[model samples]
Target: AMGPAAGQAYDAGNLDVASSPVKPTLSITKKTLTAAEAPNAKVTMELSVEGAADKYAATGLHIQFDPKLKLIPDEDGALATAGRAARLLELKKAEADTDNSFFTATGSSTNNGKDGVLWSFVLQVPADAQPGDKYDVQVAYQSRTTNEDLFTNVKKDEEGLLMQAWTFTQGIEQGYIQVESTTS
Candidate 1:
C-alpha cells in the first residue's frame, strides 16, 4: 500500500497546514433609513454586505469617498463603534504619514465573532453636497497563510496563491423619505 499520499504528507523540514488561501469578500446592498428619522431630516444609513460571514473581518477594509463627503457625529443613542466616527478621522491622519492609506475607516466593531465584526460609521451628506456628485467606497483585505509554507511549500503555495477580493461602491449619498399629508 502506498504510504500517505505525497500531498498529505508534510515535509519534515517545515510543518504547515495545507489550507486554502484566505480571501475577503464584501458587497454593499441598499441603504436603510431609520424609522425614527424626522421628516426631511438626515438619518442613519446601513450599508449591507453580500456573502458577509465570519470568514471575513473588517480590520483591513478601506472606504474611499469623494472630497465633498464629510464625517458627521451621530447624535442618536451612542452605541457600538458608530460613535467613534470622529476619532477615526484623527487616526486616519496619523496613518497617512506612514505610507498607509487609512483615511477611509470611520469606525469599527465586532460581535458574536460574525455579526458586527466589521466597520461602521456615522456620516452625513454635506449640506453643500451636490446632488449628482459620486462618492467612491473601496473594501480591501489580504489573503494570509502560515509562515511555515514560505520555506518547504514555497513553490506549491506560490503557485496556488490567489489575490484577495476587493469591492467598490460608487456614489453613496443622503437617503430620502417622502411623506404625504392628507387633508379631509
Candidate 2:
C-alpha cells in the first residue's frame, strides 16, 4: 500500500499565506439625541465594530453609563441586549465599581468578514430627569478576536491549527444624549 498522498499532509509553514493584522474600531452608533418627548421618549443606542479586516468571530464590550439614566432592560430584564442573531455571553452591571456605574456586554457572532451593529439598548428617559441634563455613554473596555474564544476547538484551519487572532487598538468614542424640553 502506498503511503499518504504527497499533498495530504497538513502544511502551512510554506504556503506564502499572506497574513495581516486588523485593528478593530468600536464606536457608538448614535452620538447625539434630543429628548423632546421626555418621560416616554426612548432612545436607541447601538455599539458597532469596524475595520476588523481579519473578520472577528467574537467580541466583548464594557460600557459605562450615567447612573441617572435608567438602563431599560430587554424583554427578559437583562441589563444588556445583543443583536437579533448574535449570541449573548454575559450581561450585567459591575458591582465593584459603583462610582462609574459600569455595565458590560459580551457576545459572539457566527457571521464573519462583515461589519454591522453588535449590541443595542433602549433607554427610557425618566419623567423627573431634568431638561438640559446630559447623560454620558462611554466605553470602559472592549476586546475583539478573529477566532471564537468560547468554541476554539472546532474553528481550526485545514491544518488543524488555530487561526490567527488580533486585538483592536483603543479607539473608543464616547457619546451623549441631552434632555430637551418638549415645549421648546
Candidate 3:
C-alpha cells in the first residue's frame, strides 16, 4: 500500500537517556552576618561549572539583592575572573529599585567552563544602612527558555545538533546572606 506511507517502526524497548548534566553552583564566602556588622563588609561569591567545563559557549548570572547592601563598583564593574582565562564579556547593574526593596545585576561571560571560580562579585553593605533590616543576596536561575532577566543554559547538547542556545536542565544551589539585630 505504497510502503505504509511513513515507514513502520519496531516495538520500543531500550530507550537511552543521556547522562545528567552538571549544574553550576553559587557559593558565598561569608554567608551569615549581623546588620551592625554589614557596613563596609566585603561579600564575595563564586560560580563553578565543574563537570561541564569546555562544553558551554557562554554563561549568564543574575543576582537580586536588597538595596541596603549596595554594590561597591570594582575596576571592571565588580566582576573578576582573574587568574582564569575566560573573562567576563559583559556586566550589567540595574539601578536599585528601592520601591521593590531590591536590585538586580546580570552578567555574561565566555564559557571555558573551568572547574573553579568561573565568576565572582564583590559587594558591600553601606554604612548609612539602618539596623533590624534582614536582607538577602541571592542568585537566580531560570529553568525555562533563555530568560532575559536571568538564566543558566548551554548550547552543547544533542538538541543543538538536532539548538538563543538550548535550556540547561540542571541544578542550582543558591546562597544567601542574613543580617540581624541580635547582640551578645
Candidate 4:
C-alpha cells in the first residue's frame, strides 16, 4: 500500500530507512562458546549472509555475550555506554559522508555495484559472562545511499523495469558472515 517511492525514499516526507526484514533469520555458526581467561572471553560467531542483498550495509553490528548487560551510568547520572562505541562512531561517520562508500554492490554496476560489505565488531565479554551457555548476539543495521532519487525520473519499461531497491536476508543460506575471536 505504498507508493513507488514509499519504500524507496522519503517516506511520508521523511527518509524511508529500513532495518531488518519482516522475519529475519538469526543464526550462529557455533552454539557453544568457550573462554580461557576471566575478564574478557573471545568467541567467534559465523552468521549466514547468503541472502543478504547488496543494497544494505551493516550499521549497528553488536555482540552480547552477557545476559546482565546494562548501560554504564556515570556518577553524575550521565549515560556511560560501552561496547564498540568507537566502531559505532566509525559507522556514523560513514553514514554522514555521501561518498564514504562503506558498502559496495557486486554483479551489477548499479548503485555502486550493489556489492555487499562485510563488517566485524570486537566486543569485551564480561568477566562474569556465564560459560558453557550461549550468549545471544544481534547485529542490527539499515540501508544507506548517496542518492535515493536516481531512479525516480526513469521511464517505466513496457515490462516494468527492474526496480532495484536494497535487499536484505532472503534465504539465510545464501549470505555468509562470521565472527572470529581474538586476544587483546
| Number of the predicted model whose lDDT against the real structure is largest | 2
TM-score of each: 0.37, 0.55, 0.52, 0.32
lDDT of 3: 0.42
Query: What value does the lDDT take at residue 94 in candidate 2?
Result: 19
Off by over 4 Å in 3: 1-21, 26-30, 34-36, 76-111, 128-134, 141-155, 159-170, 179-184
Which one wins by TM-score: 2 or 3? 2
The regions of model 1 sitting more than 4 angstroms off are 1-24, 29-43, 46-48, 74-112, 115-117, 140-184
Q: For candidate 1, which ten residues in a row score worst on lDDT?
A: 146-155
Which tens-of-lDDT digit does each residue in 1-184 have in candidate 3?
0010011221112322123344333333436666667667777745443444444444444555666666555775534343242343244343433331223333444434344555555667666544554455554434334333333324434422211121222233444555566676
Top model number, TM-score? 2
Report how far off residue 158 is in candidate 3 (Å): 2.7
Candidate 2 TM-score over all chains jointly: 0.55
Candidate 1 vs candidate 2, lDDT winner = 2
What tens digits encode model 4's per-residue C-alpha lDDT throughout 12-66? 2222323223222323244334444524544333333233233323222222223
Between candidates 1 and 4, which one is better according to TM-score? Answer: 1
lDDT order of candidates, top first: 2, 3, 1, 4
RMSD of each: 14.2, 13.1, 12.2, 12.7
For residues 1-184, could you state the per-residue lDDT of candidate 1 as single tens digits? 1111111222322322222243223332223333234223342433333222333222323333334444344465332242222232222111221121222232123211132223344444445433233343333222324111111111223312321111211111222222222334
**Overall lDDT per candidate, in order of appearance:** 0.28, 0.45, 0.42, 0.28
